[PDB]
């Protein structure tokens, strides 16, 4: 019943940094946490996705509204709500 505040961002190019994600999605609200996992055997590279958690559901909704199907570094991205604790 409570609405989600965390979103999964998919299809990030290999040029996209964690700072790029902070800068872009901060457009839509206050970010409380970001998780952008890196390639185990090549840590300088991301796995092509990020989770972004906002302070409130209205912000997450706004981000999903403007960026699911939006573009980052010349590539169309996915944005979807996520209900799960941080990975263990």
């Amino acid at each position: 019943s409570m609405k989600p505040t965390k979103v999964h961002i998919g299809r990030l190019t290999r040029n996209v940094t964690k700072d790029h994600i902070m800068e872009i999605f901060s457009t839509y609200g206050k970010i409380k946490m970001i998780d952008m996992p890196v390639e185990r055997m090549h840590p300088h590279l991301s796995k092509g996705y990020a989770y972004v958690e906002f302070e409130n559901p209205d912000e997450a909704e706004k981000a999903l509204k403007h960026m699911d199907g939006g573009q980052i570094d010349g590539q169309e991205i996915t944005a979807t709500a996520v209900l799960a604790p941080w990975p263990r």
């Binding site: 573009q71 570094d73 590539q75």
Partner: peptide, 9 residues
């Protein structure tokens, strides 16, 4: 309509 990609040459 499609934003450009960064190409490092």
């Amino acid at each position: 309509k499609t934003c450009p990609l960064l190409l490092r040459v």
